[PDB]
Amino acid sequence: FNATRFASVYAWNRKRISNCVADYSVLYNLAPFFTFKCYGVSPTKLNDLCFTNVYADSFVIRGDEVRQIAPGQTGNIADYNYKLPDDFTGCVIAWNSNKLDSKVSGNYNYLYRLFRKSNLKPFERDISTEIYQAGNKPCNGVAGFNCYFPLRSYSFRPTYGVGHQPYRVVVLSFELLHAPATVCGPKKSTNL
């Protein structure tokens, strides 16, 4: 969450959290910037609900598409980049970072996927930069008429509106593996 640099949409990063206590109080509390939507779980009970290997995935996408990072929603971001599982059991935090992630010249670091042969499966990432061919003539290894590079840049700029300004989302997925419980958060601690 407090990281200085954040991953692009095509290479959405993942960080497994395991064998450890997790504090969700720092998150969730003070909810104005966030758009906490806890699909599949109790937002208040995240502290008491124990999962087997909590995962966290972080990317920067325009604020219009924070919605497409939802179970069962179809759009360029979730049919070609990050697809959430129908049985998603994790929250989807998101916030506004125009100041941290934008520059007057226009940040072009973040890139997005506009062409994949078929919709990607749940929690799946493809980082290959290979050309996409819709034409009968083969791609030939160079992007060309009817062949498209899979990564177009996100043109962030400072004066842009709330809808198109950069928003950073950390989709904290949780998995109930038949594995022994690892991420558990309760303490309470009363005096003897």
């Epitope: 034409g135 992007a143 590079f149 043109s155």
Partner: antibody, heavy 116, light 104 residues
Framework: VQLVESGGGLIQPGGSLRLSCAVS??????MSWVRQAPGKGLECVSV???????DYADSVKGRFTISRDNSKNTLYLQMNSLRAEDTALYYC?????????????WGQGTMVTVSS | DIQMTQSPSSVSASVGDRVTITCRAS??????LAWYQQKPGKAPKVLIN???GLQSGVPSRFSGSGSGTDFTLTISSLQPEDFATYYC?????????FGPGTKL
């Protein structure tokens, strides 16, 4: 987002002319020069891609070059061996977009003409 | 040039009535055709979504038809601004060829 097109001036036959269109509101990446033809519908003169690969109309092949100035965001079209048929109104347009070849935001265009 | 043709050469249309336009293709460009709208003294702008997925930025008025060599465009409500020239580009292969076109 309007594209500033200049260099649309009458030129002699067989001559070489450069058409310069400044591009604003988006980075030049995939762009083209569709030409509106007087007495006819739109026809295609030249196209460019983000990689820098360039494809040209068979009639204009070998006489036209299109390049992107990264610093100035300006398309450059050089026309050689100018002929009455080749001369026409020209526009700077995004060459292709999305799943298949979308020509979308079209500048007001420069009327390029040849006369002896 | 690809064998691109349109029918009819001219369209005569009363206000607020159904109007249909036709175009022809010979490489059997499959499901790759696009439509553009221009009025006199105007720079033409996007009409059909160029087969990218579904028509975008437009209401139910415009009709998306174009499978194999057969494509049609019809709009039931002819608003005064709507009457304009209609051109169809070729999406099958470069060099792309725009259709001869027909106006209201």
């Amino acid at each position: 987002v309007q594209l500033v097109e200049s260099g649309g001036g009458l030129i002699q036959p067989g001559g070489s002319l450069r058409l310069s269109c400044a591009v604003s509101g988006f980075t030049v990446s995939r762009m083209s020069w569709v030409r509106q033809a007087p007495g006819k519908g739109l026809e295609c003169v030249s196209v460019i891609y983000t990689g820098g690969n360039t494809d040209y109309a068979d009639s204009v092949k070998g006489r036209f070059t299109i390049s992107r100035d990264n610093s100035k965001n300006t398309l450059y079209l050089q026309m050689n061996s100018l002929r009455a048929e080749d001369t026409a109104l020209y526009y700077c347009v995004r060459g292709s977009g999305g799943i298949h070849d979308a020509f979308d935001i079209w500048g007001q265009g420069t009327m390029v003409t040849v006369s002896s | 040039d690809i064998q691109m043709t349109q029918s009819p050469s001219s369209v005569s249309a009363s206000v607020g009535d159904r109007v249909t336009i036709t175009c022809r293709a010979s490489q059997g460009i499959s499901t790759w055709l696009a439509w553009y709208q221009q009025k006199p003294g105007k720079a033409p702008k996007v009409l059909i979504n160029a087969a990218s997925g579904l028509q975008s930025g437009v209401p139910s008025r415009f009709s998306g038809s174009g499978s194999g060599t057969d494509f049609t465009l019809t709009i039931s409500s002819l608003q005064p601004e709507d009457f304009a020239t209609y051109y169809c580009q070729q999406a099958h292969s470069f060099p792309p060829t725009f259709g001869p076109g027909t106006k209201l």
